[PDB]
Amino acid sequence: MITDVQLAIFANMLGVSLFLLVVLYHYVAVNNPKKQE
Predict the structure, then answer these.
(1) What is the DSSP string of the chain?
(2) In sequence order, which residues have a C-beta less than 8 Å from that of residue 27 and are 6 or more positions away?
(3) What distance, in Å, lies between the first and last C-alpha atoms of the chain?
(4) Are 28 and 35 contacting, i.e. CB atoms less than 8 angstroms apart?
(5) d(CA 20, CA 27)
(6) How far apart are CA 16 and CA 4, in angstroms?
(7) How many CB atoms are located within 10 Å of the residue 29 CB?
(8) Which residues contact 28 (CB under 8 A, 6 or more apart)?
(9) d(CA 32, CA 16)
(10) Which residues, 6 or more positions from 29, have their beta carbon under 8 angstroms from its beta carbon?
């Protein structure tokens, strides 16, 4: 917020992967009658 805010992009992405993946997984899995396992 004051400095080295660039690294934040590397840290946020390092998690957004395991996050967005799960989020979209649960949603699609609950929205789709034939989830993909």
Answers:
(1) --S-HHHHHHHHHHHHHHHHHHHHHHHHHHH-TT---
(2) none
(3) 40
(4) yes
(5) 10
(6) 19
(7) 14
(8) 35
(9) 23
(10) 35
For residue 35, give every residue at least 6 positions away whose Cβ sits within 8 Å of its Cβ, in sequence order, or none: 28, 29
Q: Which residue shows structure tokens 């934040």?
A: 8
Contact 7, 14 (CB under 8 A): no
Residue 17 vs residues 4, 30, 33, 36: alpha-carbon distances, Å = 22, 20, 24, 18
The owner of tokens 């998690």 is 15
Approach to solving: NMR
